[PDB]
């Protein structure tokens, strides 16, 4: 469950995944965090 409120945040953050990159650890980087449960609302699923 990733949850980012921000759709410059969310760009970048699949965007670093392309290349080869975690997005657990670019996660680590924009701030949107990733969580096993905890359904994040729609402000948060940006």
Known sequence: ????????????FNVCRLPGTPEALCATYTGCIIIPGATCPGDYAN
């Not at 469950?1 to 970048?12: D, E, G, K, L």
């Open 1 to 12: 469950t990733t949850c980012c409120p921000s759709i410059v945040a969310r760009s970048n």
